[PDB]
Scaffold this active site. Structure first.
Site, mmCIF file in Angstrom:
data_model
loop_
_atom_site.group_PDB
_atom_site.id
_atom_site.type_symbol
_atom_site.label_atom_id
_atom_site.label_comp_id
_atom_site.label_asym_id
_atom_site.label_seq_id
_atom_site.Cartn_x
_atom_site.Cartn_y
_atom_site.Cartn_z
ATOM 1 N N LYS A 18 1.498 6.717 40.590
ATOM 2 C CA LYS A 18 2.496 7.065 39.594
ATOM 3 C C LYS A 18 3.308 5.818 39.212
ATOM 4 O O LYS A 18 3.916 5.162 40.077
ATOM 5 C CB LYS A 18 3.449 8.161 40.072
ATOM 6 N N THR A 19 3.342 5.540 37.913
ATOM 7 C CA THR A 19 3.990 4.356 37.370
ATOM 8 C C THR A 19 5.458 4.580 36.912
ATOM 9 O O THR A 19 5.954 5.682 36.866
ATOM 10 C CB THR A 19 3.215 3.902 36.133
ATOM 11 N N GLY A 20 6.122 3.501 36.561
ATOM 12 C CA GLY A 20 7.430 3.564 36.033
ATOM 13 C C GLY A 20 7.805 2.221 35.427
ATOM 14 O O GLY A 20 7.223 1.200 35.788
ATOM 15 N N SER B 99 10.216 6.304 36.450
ATOM 16 C CA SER B 99 9.336 7.509 36.486
ATOM 17 C C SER B 99 8.524 7.706 37.768
ATOM 18 O O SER B 99 7.785 8.710 37.865
ATOM 19 C CB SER B 99 8.334 7.458 35.358
ATOM 20 N N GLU C 201 17.532 8.861 30.777
ATOM 21 C CA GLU C 201 18.770 8.139 31.215
ATOM 22 C C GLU C 201 18.699 7.516 32.601
ATOM 23 O O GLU C 201 19.389 6.529 32.861
ATOM 24 C CB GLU C 201 20.018 9.025 31.275
HETATM 25 C C1 LIG Z 1 9.491 6.173 33.287
HETATM 26 O O1 LIG Z 1 9.165 5.185 33.904
HETATM 27 C C2 LIG Z 1 9.482 6.329 31.782
HETATM 28 C C3 LIG Z 1 8.182 6.948 31.204
HETATM 29 N N1 LIG Z 1 7.118 6.741 32.202
HETATM 30 C C4 LIG Z 1 6.461 5.703 31.940
HETATM 31 C C5 LIG Z 1 5.144 5.356 32.480
HETATM 32 O O2 LIG Z 1 5.014 5.313 33.720
HETATM 33 O O3 LIG Z 1 4.171 5.156 31.718
HETATM 34 C C6 LIG Z 1 7.400 4.996 31.022
HETATM 35 S S1 LIG Z 1 7.224 3.293 30.793
HETATM 36 C C7 LIG Z 1 6.507 2.298 29.538
HETATM 37 C C8 LIG Z 1 6.868 2.509 28.064
HETATM 38 N N2 LIG Z 1 5.660 1.982 27.449
HETATM 39 C C9 LIG Z 1 4.584 1.704 28.407
HETATM 40 C C10 LIG Z 1 3.161 2.062 28.090
HETATM 41 O O4 LIG Z 1 2.316 1.188 28.174
HETATM 42 N N3 LIG Z 1 2.851 3.305 27.741
HETATM 43 C C11 LIG Z 1 2.513 4.344 28.724
HETATM 44 C C12 LIG Z 1 2.796 3.677 26.329
HETATM 45 C C13 LIG Z 1 5.015 2.427 29.678
HETATM 46 C C14 LIG Z 1 7.640 6.118 30.024
HETATM 47 C C15 LIG Z 1 8.635 5.923 28.871
HETATM 48 C C16 LIG Z 1 10.718 7.166 31.491
HETATM 49 C C17 LIG Z 1 11.853 6.739 32.431
HETATM 50 O O5 LIG Z 1 11.057 7.024 30.094
#
Ligand SMILES: *C(=O)[C@@H]([C@@H]1N=C(C(=O)O)[C@@H](S[C@@H]2CN[C@H](C(=O)N(C)C)C2)[C@@H]1C)[C@@H](C)O
Ligand SMILES: *C(=O)[C@@H]([C@@H]1N=C(C(=O)O)[C@@H](S[C@@H]2CN[C@H](C(=O)N(C)C)C2)[C@@H]1C)[C@@H](C)O
EC number: 3.5.2.6
Lengths: 256, 256
Positions: free
Chosen positions: B201-203, B39, B135
């Site tokens: 921005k996380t992922g 992400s 995906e």
């Molecule tokens: C991308 O990385 C995914 C979506 N973006 C995210 C994020 O940056 O928060 C994820 S990751 C992950 C799932 N549970 C973790 C959490 O602590 N929460 C935010 C609830 C983060 C999110 C699914 C995308 C590719 O699905």
């Protein structure tokens, strides 16, 4: 009662008033108890700035020195050399609770006594602005200067943000800024589900006062206006953000 | 070396690149190693969206249906009935990592293949957008679709956020959405000294991939641009956010 329980849990006194503008249903708990408003006043202060200026007039540049800076100047401290427009000062005051920005805006509107007069003009006989920032935060129990009530802050925030104390393009600036507040994540925002839009302004003062006022837009339905105020019995007391968040969840339950 | 020690403690592979825009000093550890971007791509996707629209164009309302909703839709699931504007979609994508928001935005700019071509245009020959979300997070070792490197993400994030791939007003929208991210508290934000502002921005993705890219503003001075990427050798591996935080602290020491 859940609100009594929160007070028990956090050893604090809560002031709550919430109004569902779609139904006119309310949720009250010490709605008329006085609390130091603290930096929540920044929101009503911008309300009055907007009422008194065209939009274009907010582009006027304000010059200042380190002498107009006070204890908390997160944005203003970056811009001593160039100054800031009234618009950028509104932004800084609402979204970062910049104290110097508040004082500079307060000066443009004529000071605390002139803010007070303007709030009386829009129908608020409760809110008592007396001092500049930060000293408005020093309020002892029983005193009335720089205090308001949950009921009055809601009524006044609604009047500017949702009613007809401002025209639509000015209400939009106010709501945009408040929506994009940075100081409020652990407060009203933490007691509402994601995807419910929140516009808020936080406050904190002495006697562990910890406040948040907000307009909350549920996914469909009309907005809720909400004040959640709290204070404690020792001058130097700590507050706990979780109290406002938990209180906020109780209000939403009660209203749905 | 501290980065190796973090690799050992957390049984993971780290990809680090940081650039101090003030001094041009850099910190690298596996800076050219590929990781699934996950992400983090959302930030770059808004950069392109912003570049291709006027700010006023962002108010175009997008209608969508429940087919557009995917696995993780915190904001977008609440407004199927009204739709949301591009501006509102950008906020949801960036501040909540809303997947549907990202897919709608991606469709507005013509899709991943079109996003890739806009990235080539700002000078990024590394980042490989290929799929919609989620995906894009299914990347097996040695594969290059939906991967980038710490160096490239830093280079591309700088370019949109700080340099001249956007005019200042749009940089400001981008930077403010990322400063107000709600998903990054336990990551880069945790390894930065208090009251330094951070845009991030996380992922996360398969093989325990756990990522965060950011811009960090020392109180006075030019910002640091930072990518901290990680992954591990089992497909279903758990990640640890503490890795990212600790790596960040190491970055900060090596730059101070
Ligand atoms: C991308 O990385 C995914 C979506 N973006 C995210 C994020 O940056 O928060 C994820 S990751 C992950 C799932 N549970 C973790 C959490 O602590 N929460 C935010 C609830 C983060 C999110 C699914 C995308 C590719 O699905
Ligand atoms: C507001 O009430 C006061 C200034 N605005 C603030 C705010 O609303 O966030 C305060 S809050 C207080 C200071 N420390 C706590 C915190 O979380 N921060 C480190 C921001 C909350 C800020 C001093 C004004 C009356 O001074």
């Amino acid at each position: 009662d859940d609100f009594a329980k929160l007070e028990e849990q956090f050893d604090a006194k809560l002031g709550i008033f919430a109004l569902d503008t779609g139904t006119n249903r309310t949720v009250a708990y010490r709605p008329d108890e006085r609390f130091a408003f603290a930096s929540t006043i920044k929101a009503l202060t911008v309300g009055v700035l907007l009422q008194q200026k065209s939009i274009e007039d907010l582009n006027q540049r304000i010059t200042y020195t380190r002498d107009d800076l006070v204890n908390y100047n997160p944005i203003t401290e970056k811009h001593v050399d160039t100054g800031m427009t009234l618009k950028e000062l509104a932004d800084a005051s609402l979204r970062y609770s910049d104290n110097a920005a508040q004082n500079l805006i307060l000066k443009q509107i004529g000071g605390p006594e002139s803010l007070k007069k303007e709030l009386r003009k829009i129908g608020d006989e409760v809110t008592n602005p007396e001092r500049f920032s930060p000293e408005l935060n020093e309020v002892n129990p029983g005193e009335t200067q720089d205090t308001s009530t949950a009921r009055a802050l809601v009524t006044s925030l609604r009047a500017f943000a949702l009613e007809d104390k401002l025209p639509s393009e000015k209400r939009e600036l106010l709501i945009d800024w408040m929506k994009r507040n940075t100081t409020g994540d652990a407060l009203i925002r933490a007691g509402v589900p994601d995807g419910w839009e929140v516009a808020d302004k936080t406050g904190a003062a002495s006697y562990g006062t910890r406040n948040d006022i907000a307009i909350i837009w549920p996914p469909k339905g009309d907005p809720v206006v909400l004040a959640v105020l709290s204070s404690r019995d020792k001058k130097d007391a700590k507050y706990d953000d979780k109290l406002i968040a938990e209180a906020t969840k109780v209000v939403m339950k009660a209203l749905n």
